[PDB]
Amino acid sequence: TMPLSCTKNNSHHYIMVGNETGLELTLTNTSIINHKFCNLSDAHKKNLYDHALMSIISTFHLSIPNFNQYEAMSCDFNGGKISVQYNLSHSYAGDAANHCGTVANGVLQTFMRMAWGGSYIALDSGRGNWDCIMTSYQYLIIQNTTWEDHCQFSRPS
Ligand SMILES: *[C@@H]1O[C@H](CO)[C@@H](O[C@@H]2O[C@H](CO)[C@@H](O)[C@H](O)[C@H]2NC(C)=O)[C@H](O)[C@H]1NC(C)=O
Ligand SMILES: *[C@@H]1O[C@H](CO)[C@@H](O[C@@H]2O[C@H](CO)[C@@H](O)[C@H](O)[C@H]2NC(C)=O)[C@H](O)[C@H]1NC(C)=O
Ligand SMILES: *[C@@H]1O[C@H](CO)[C@@H](O)[C@H](O)[C@H]1NC(C)=O
Ligand SMILES: *[C@@H]1O[C@H](CO)[C@@H](O)[C@H](O)[C@H]1NC(C)=O
């Protein structure tokens, strides 16, 4: 049985994309995906993935800089419902600076500025309003889920 998303040790927020679907964003020290893969092996999975990230980018109004940087990322599918896990490299100042131009960083920024949970540190990046965010959280988890089920992690596969 899956762990809870809504816990005192987690920071969480739900994005309501559709009329009945959405994304549960969870900052946690709990790993949900146990492999190193993100198999977007078909055009359908490939669009669900882009739809998930665009929804985040639109909603949080993320103007993400081009720094040629990446977060370690796994993803999985459970009957059309995607799970994305970021293995965050934001634990120390250099890491935040080197993983600044990522979607995961934008989420951290949003959590920080919106005060959605957890304490963070913003390092001035090179570009405008964009800050490189430090956090002690090990994982950022994004799951296609409903509001009724958003407080418990869904099963990835
Ligand atoms: C999540 O894990 C980290 C360790 O990876 C916990 O500990 C923090 O780690 C950072 C970086 O090593 C330190 O700067 C902090 O001082 C540590 N804090 C504590 C209390 O140990 C972190 O606390 C964990 N968070 C949760 C909510 O479990
Ligand atoms: C993110 O971290 C988790 C946990 O540290 C990784 O999960 C491990 O993945 C390896 C595959 O190389 C397995 O052999 C281990 O059993 C997994 N451990 C656990 C606790 O699940 C995960 O692969 C990492 N993802 C990325 C993209 O780096
Ligand atoms: C992803 O694909 C690789 C190679 O095709 C395979 O070894 C791996 O098991 C796949 N992962 C998942 C979660 O299906
Ligand atoms: C969640 O999955 C369903 C079915 O795959 C899809 O219709 C819906 O758009 C997805 N939600 C998001 C936010 O991508």
Residue numbers in the entry: 81 to 237
What do the authors say?
Lassa virus (LASV) is an enveloped, ambi-sense, bi-segmented RNA virus endemic throughout Western Africa and is the most lethal of all known Old World arenaviruses. GP is synthesized as an inactive precursor preGPC, which is co-translationally cleaved by signal peptidase into GPC and the stable signal peptide (SSP). Post-translational maturation cleavage of GPC by host protease SKI-1/S1P yields the receptor-binding subunit GP1 and the membrane-spanning fusion subunit GP2. SSP is not only critical by functioning as a trans-acting maturation factor, but also associates with the GP2 subunit, resulting in a tripartite mature GP complex on the viral surface.
To account for possible effects of chemical fixation, we exploited a previously reported stable cell line expressing non-infectious virus-like particles (VLPs) displaying the full-length LASV GP but lacking the Z. Similar to the fixed virions, VLPs purified from cell culture supernatants were covered with GP spikes (VLP pH 7). To study GP conformation at endosomal pH, we determined the VLP-derived GP structure at pH 5.2 (pH 5, and S1 Fig VLP pH 5). The structure was resolved at 16-Å resolution and revealed conformational differences when compared to the same structure at pH 7.3 (pH 7). These can be attributed to a conformational difference at the membrane-proximal legs and a slight opening up of the spike, creating crevices at the top of the spike between the GP subunits. To localize the GP1 and determine its orientation relative to the LAMP1 binding site, we used volumetric correlation to fit the GP1 crystal structure into our GP reconstruction. As the GP1 has been crystallized at pH 5 and acidic pH has been suggested to have an effect on GP1 conformation, we used our GP structure derived from VLPs at pH 5 for fitting. The fitting was unambiguous (cross-correlation coefficient 0.86) and placed the GP1 structure to the membrane distal part of the spike. Interestingly, the triad of histidines that has been indicated in LAMP1 binding points towards the crevice between GP1 subunits, the putative LAMP1 binding side. The histidines may act as a pH sensor opening up the spike at pH 5 to create a binding site for LAMP1, but further studies are needed to test this hypothesis. Here, the membrane-distal GP1 remained bound to the membrane-anchored GP2 at pH 5.0, possibly providing an analogous shielding function and at the same time creating a binding site for the intra-cellular receptor LAMP1.
